[PDB]
Amino acid sequence: KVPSDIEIAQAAKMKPVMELARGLGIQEDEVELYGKYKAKISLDVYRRLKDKPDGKLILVTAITPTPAGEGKTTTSVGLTDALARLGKRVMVCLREPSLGPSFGIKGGAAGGGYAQVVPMEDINLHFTGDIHAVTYAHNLLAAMVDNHLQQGNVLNIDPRTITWRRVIDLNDRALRNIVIGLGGKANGVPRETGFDISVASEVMACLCLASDLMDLKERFSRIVVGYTYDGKPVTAGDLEAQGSMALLMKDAIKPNLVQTLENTPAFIHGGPFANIAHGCNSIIATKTALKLADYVVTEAGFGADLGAEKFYDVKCRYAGFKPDATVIVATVRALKMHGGVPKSDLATENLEALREGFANLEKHIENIGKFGVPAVVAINAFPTDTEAELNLLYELCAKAGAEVALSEVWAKGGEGGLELARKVLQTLESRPSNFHVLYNLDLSIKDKIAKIATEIYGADGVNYTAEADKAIQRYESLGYGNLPVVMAKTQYSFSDDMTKLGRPRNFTITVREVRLSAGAGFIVPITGAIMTMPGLPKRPAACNIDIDADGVITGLF
Amino acid sequence: KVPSDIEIAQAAKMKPVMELARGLGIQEDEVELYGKYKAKISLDVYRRLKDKPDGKLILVTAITPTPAGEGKTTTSVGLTDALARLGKRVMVCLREPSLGPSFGIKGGAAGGGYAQVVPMEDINLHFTGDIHAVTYAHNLLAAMVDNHLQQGNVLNIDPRTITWRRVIDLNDRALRNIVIGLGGKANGVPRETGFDISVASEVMACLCLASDLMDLKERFSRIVVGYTYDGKPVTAGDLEAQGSMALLMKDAIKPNLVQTLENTPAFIHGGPFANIAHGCNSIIATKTALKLADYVVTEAGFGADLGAEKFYDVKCRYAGFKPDATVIVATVRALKMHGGVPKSDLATENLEALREGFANLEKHIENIGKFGVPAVVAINAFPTDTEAELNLLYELCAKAGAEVALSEVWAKGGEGGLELARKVLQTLESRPSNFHVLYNLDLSIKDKIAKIATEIYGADGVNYTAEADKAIQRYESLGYGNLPVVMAKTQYSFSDDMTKLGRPRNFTITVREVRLSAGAGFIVPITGAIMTMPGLPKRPAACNIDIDADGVITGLF
Amino acid sequence: NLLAAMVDNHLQQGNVLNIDPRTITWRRVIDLNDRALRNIVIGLGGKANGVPRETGFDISVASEVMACLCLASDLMDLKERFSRIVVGYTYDGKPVTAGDLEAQGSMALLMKDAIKPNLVQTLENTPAFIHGGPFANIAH
């Protein structure tokens, strides 16, 4: 049988999200429809269920990404289906994807196979407009910065230091580096700047970490946009922009309820970068699903070393959350690559390479342990996976000493994860959690990076360029020394060197630069150029995308 | 006595729009809700009612705009309400406002006082997302032009001839003139360009003039983006972008149902410029309205010399409409300015300056008669007008052969529009229109500009600069010389000089530049500097805007 | 600066050598200390005014032409050296030289007196030559 993910999405029998909401005891007037199959949930649903028991919190993370793929989100939705099959009160919370990729390398299912959140096509495009709202809040601050300079530069901004760029949610490399403000005294003040993809915006990071709209407003007011000629930070707060930015985000601050193909209730809300930001869906979604369900399944971008760590160290930290379980997803095709197998050679089994690659997963496993969180492993199964392999790895997890199940959610739906699901419940009943942040907000910036590189990535140590030192010194000195640290580095290695697969030892990490998100409330060490505006390829999906007299869309997926 | 606009609109008791829809004979599955009080309606309505007769079509326009204000949209909504009170089955169709002005000069009612369409807050902000859709269709085409240059430039476009700019829906003067594609070979091709405000987008003009989604796609394929090194035009179609643009507009193509404060149904859809475009809401909303209702009230931007002329000569020409009557809104104060009274002295009675400024209203009344449409004058009441002023103005209207009514819809809602509405009904009953457009498309471009300039503006003739001559000569030989012409000129005068108020004589107009909108399907001759991207003022409304814990918004209106 | 003018004219006149303007390494010079000329963008104004590209000025004594003067054996060797200067690369990554642009004869003509060393003297009248004056970091 030849099934494609879009066909599965279309054939799905979606339920009115209205009744979905009714059954979680969301009231009528706390729902805000967009069509039959999407809605926004009011912040009142948490403000009322304020003191209700929080359900259980299950983080889904994964091993180190590879060109092979690991299906973190697929198994994350599959596990959600399973729990509801086994009759529990369960929502999955996921990230909203950027619109841009649909016109570049194609859009995809939220999840995969038979473990999707739907309706897929809306999720991939405008959805309920939250990224437009982010784009506008971000770009109005920029317009206002620029208007300030033109109106006499009362705050004495040095235009050449402005760090606030603009955004748009298309992949447009011609906007990476531009000069604006040309054409004369009527037309603004010439300066050098650029655009990043909207999901990279600090506004998107604020959205995702705010508790409520007034909290969002205050974060905005703290954003540093640039410096006076004398070196003094100037903030969005100084430009009186935070009110208008909060008005623009009035609706985007509400989570979007949609659903699984088996009508299990999903929240999709927020979608930051996982390198220069924490890679999680909003705090507002997760804590709402907490009050509303017994079991909240959620995820973080990239491998356990970045997403998981950031989930724990910044998201839970701010939310007061204390996660109960964490699933680490892994595939045999991936761990083989970590064993040194070229991608064109995954057709054969290699039990020797799978023994080699495992060291990756094992490091991730240990890493979860360091947080006080009961691990559990999940193998994403696949056609070419052999039982010799699956057993090997299965026993290697046992030999490693953490819970493990196999998952066939891709091709089997929420049945393919019932085993995994019982594991997690196994784990939730018997193994509490002793969850604590990996470090304290009182250590110096270097101590914090130190602690992350040392325990998590397992570097021998950290070096700093000269301007990394100058920036750190300057931040300590400006008051921003007590913040969490968000490590921007390659996701493809524990180390900062993307060729280093498996579990590299002996290496050290190098901080080349350091940035500040004052509004998000974190410090951003960077270890390599980070790509914040990806470009379109030689033959973009856009060129084959079509929509006909009937509304039939081709080329999109 | 009368509340403010913002308080008026919050105290409004709105009906669920689904109720209004089923009231109109629209089926449930033709309706897509966005909350209880907005919906998008399917183009299937029009299609299944394609054979039904059209209702009566009433255009609302105004005298030449002045700093005194004329109150045109208030008159549209108030007339609509008065018609519903007289028992008529009536809809109003209106433009969506741009998001930008909310943050600069301040947003405002769609209407004013007791004549508004609601929900006001959403209408002014993201509404149902149409403008975000226009922004992204437009900016994706620009991204694809730039990617084409980057990927080897197979079409051999000369980057310096590219006319397709970018858009954003905020007032940002610093984006008027920019240089993009900097950073070296991996970052695009250096070129000079800029942003316009999104509602100025040709994509917005295409939305407003499309008959449906596939016609919109076709229009997209015809947009000229630049020329090759040999001077041949290059289109969106040559770049294969139209399918994607169409996909991005798949919901924006649907008109939006909302309502007046008295619950009369209202469509809001599209919102182009009135100088470089035709200044009307979409053909799609108007034509659907005409099937659903027996009377449809719509309006056009700027005074009757610009919006009414383009309503008749572009929008009616494309759609096959034949307007039945036209209401011209005037005020005592605006006419006194046209007769030489400075703004600071408009309260003082001045029958002689009113008699002189009336020549402005007299010329508009004559102009509407040249399209074969009977005209009724609506006088928006103002507290300081004297009886003798009103009485003189009525006698001058009757001497000019127009019916006239005092309108007090601002203060009294639909009840204040009853005399206006009955004069319109008496006109519809006893003077059927003999509608015809002003000019045949087969005239040369110059003969079309002269017809409009001499007959509508009262100009002696038209001069052209050398650049305007060459442009005209190129477009004629490229095959675009049979299109409608859309004059972009100041709205403050019949002439191209904004300080010639009243009915100026012995003047000539000077066309300085001619541009092409090949997708929207017209030629745009330009007289003075046209501001396609307005700037923020010294103190933007954005600095005063707040929203509190309650969701209470101050500073916005 | 004549070589730079000829590179830019080549782009303007149809770019027959197919230089990628963004790979061009030949900058301009002036012999004043002007930091504002370090990073610039030229060729703006539309199709009649050149090809937009990013470039800058160095101080004249940093010029490779200055290094060539100092290392030439005579005028014809200087002309030859000129013909070998790499100014940028084509879209395929092949180098493009002053020789491919046929500029070396003109450059040589402009240096026809500069190729001659200058006799002056010390305060005690001992004879002295003064001639050429390159950087000591990016040149010798």
From Swiss-Prot, chains A, B:
Gene3D superfamilies named in the record: Domain 2, N(10)-formyltetrahydrofolate synthetase (3.30.1510.10), Formyltetrahydrofolate synthetase, domain 3 (3.10.410.10), P-loop containing nucleotide triphosphate hydrolases (3.40.50.300)
> Is Magnesium included in the keywords of this UniProt record?
no
Name of the top EC class for this enzyme: ligase
Enzyme Commission designation: 6.3.4.3
What is this protein's name? Formate--tetrahydrofolate ligase
Recorded source organism is Moorella thermoacetica (strain ATCC 39073 / JCM 9320)
Top-rank taxon, per record = Bacteria
Under catalytic activity, the entry for this protein gives: (6S)-5,6,7,8-tetrahydrofolate + formate + ATP = (6R)-10-formyltetrahydrofolate + ADP + phosphate
Q: Which family does it belong to?
A: Belongs to the formate--tetrahydrofolate ligase family.
